[model samples]
Target: AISIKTPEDIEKMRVAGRLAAEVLEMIEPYVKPGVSTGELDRICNDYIVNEQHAVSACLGYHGYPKSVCISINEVVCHGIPDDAKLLKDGDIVNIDVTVIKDGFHGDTSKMFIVGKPTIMGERLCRITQESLYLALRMVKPGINLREIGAAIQKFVEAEGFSVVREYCGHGIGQGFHEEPQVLHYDSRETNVVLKPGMTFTIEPMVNAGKKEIRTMKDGWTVKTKDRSLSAQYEHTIVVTDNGCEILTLRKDDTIPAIISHD
Candidate 1:
């Protein structure tokens, strides 16, 4: 079952979302070509701790070793930050972070173009982002939950990209990873109506190759089976009376913070 929020809960969730978004904004310049993944994790963890005064949503999460998840190149999601993994040109890494503030969790991630980018890498990132943005248009009262994924799948495939079926988004709250899993494709199981206050993520993992993915030996990192580049964009959002408000909206995003279909 899905959890609804009260006015006080909504305010707390907003704060958590704002703090999570600040990490990506402040760490933008640091996401260059010549750095270690572990180093990036350190910087991210420090900001969440010292500056935000918030708890990291990834560290020690289900025995997750790193504070932030840094998946580079073919890696799809849940890639653990490693000191040995070095960043270079022609690489696109997805940085995912969640901040827990006031017992509320805000989860989101974004694709960062390394110092240099490849033609395929750049295109994949752009198209993946637009898919998420387009899916946002499907979120409103009376819209079935599966319609969100249907919209994303149609848009991604139209661009010659495939959406990964393994990793779907989920509701985020005090417990984190709450009920009513949100899929990136039309699974048809989430036929529930999206009423106001139903918060969840709509992250679509669009792959440059086939939708098939292979999990790495680390038991966490998942990558495209064909070794093709993959990109993803995530945002925490909740249904509103008319449309939906992007809870984890960023400064660079062109979408409205509070949207209204009416």
Candidate 2:
């Protein structure tokens, strides 16, 4: 069953969310070419533990064995950070961060262009982030949750991209995962209704090629089967009386300008 977050719960989430965003901001400059994904992970781990006095939620999460997930290029999600995975110029990567503060969890991810990107690579990242915002705009009490996925599917496909169907968003609170799975594709069959105080994430993974994916030998990393590019953006939010509040919003202007465009 979905648990309704109390006002206090929302407050705790706000704090957690802000910290997660800060961690992302703190690691922005170091994402350039030649830096290893493991190095980025170390930077985030230290800041979360020593500076923020919080815990990295992804560490040891079901044996994840990492402080953060750094998915580069073809990897869809759950890309394990490794010292050998050195980022190079023109590479696009997604840095997913989750931190637990005051017993509440905040999860968010952003795309980074290591240097100049190919036109297709830039387009993929822009549309994927915009799709996430478009979906969030539809959240409100009494609205059909399916509208969230419907909006994403329409926009993504219109841009000649496909949404990954294997993974969907979920309810988040005290537990890392919870009730009410949020699909990124349209489905009239779902009957879930949005209610006030419902907290969850809306993370859409869009692929520049086919939606097909495969698991890496590490049993954690997921990559595109066609070796095409993929991009994603996530935000934890709570349904409100009118609409919703984005809990994991990044305040810094560190993100690329293309992401802010419609």
Candidate 3:
């Protein structure tokens, strides 16, 4: 269901995105060593429901079990939060939240380090974030969607890192998964002209070692095949007349909330 959002839809997405970003913000203090991923999930669900009075798109999403995705260490993405997974010092964690507010979906994720940070862990997270920034910086009217992945792939590979190929960002709106499957690598693919009002996500998962990934038996969690560390950053955005609007922007985000094509 490809769609060009109307002003009303874009307005709703702003609300949805704020709630999603708040979830990540509210849970930051509680993300410490000895905390369980399941506990973090509960904390997020309550805020999404009680505080924000919104719905979680990740819960019961195609029978996927979790309120949010808490991927840690080697796990690439889609890691289900459970009591068994506890935070440990020096562990890198990625929490992904998607909320449905006013019938629109806003998706975003961020990285958190438990206790203290390790050199490799910190670098991977930083590079992954920069890779995402490069993609976001290139966004503007008349830009091809293919450039999104190309920009990410180029920067990631240059740092000797690899971008996860199996999973790429997708168009998000009233329907969770919309048209124009956003690839993280340069597919030399479609000329999907990104016009104003086209909203989608650009979540790039970068691995420290190789690009290979392995899906676990649970049929949900994904981990790096070589057991190397992984990191990711995601945000939902819309093509604007001049540039783009980052619907899921957090308060302290170094990435600019809005970019003008100028």
For candidate 3, give the lDDT of residue 24: 91
Best by lDDT: 3
User: Number of clashes in model 3?
Assistant: 0
Error at 220, model 3, angstroms = 1.0
| Per-residue lDDT over 37-102 for candidate 2, one digit per residue giving the tens place of the 0 to 100 score | 999999999999999999999999998999999999999999998999899988989999999999
Q: Weakest 10 consecutive residues, lDDT, candidate 2?
A: 253-262
Q: How many clashes in candidate 1?
A: 0
The residue-by-residue lDDT of candidate 1 on 158-245, one tens digit each, is 9899999988889888878997788988875768788899888889999998999999888899999999889999999888899999
lDDT of 3 by residue, 24-134 (tens): 999999999999999999999999999899999999999988899999999999989999889999999999999999899999999998998999999999999898888
* Segments in model 3 whose C-alpha atoms lie over 4 Å from true places: none
lDDT of 3 at 177: 86
Model 1, residue 14: distance off in Å is 0.6
Kindly give the number of clashing pairs for every candidate. 0, 0, 0
TM-score of each: 0.98, 0.95, 0.98
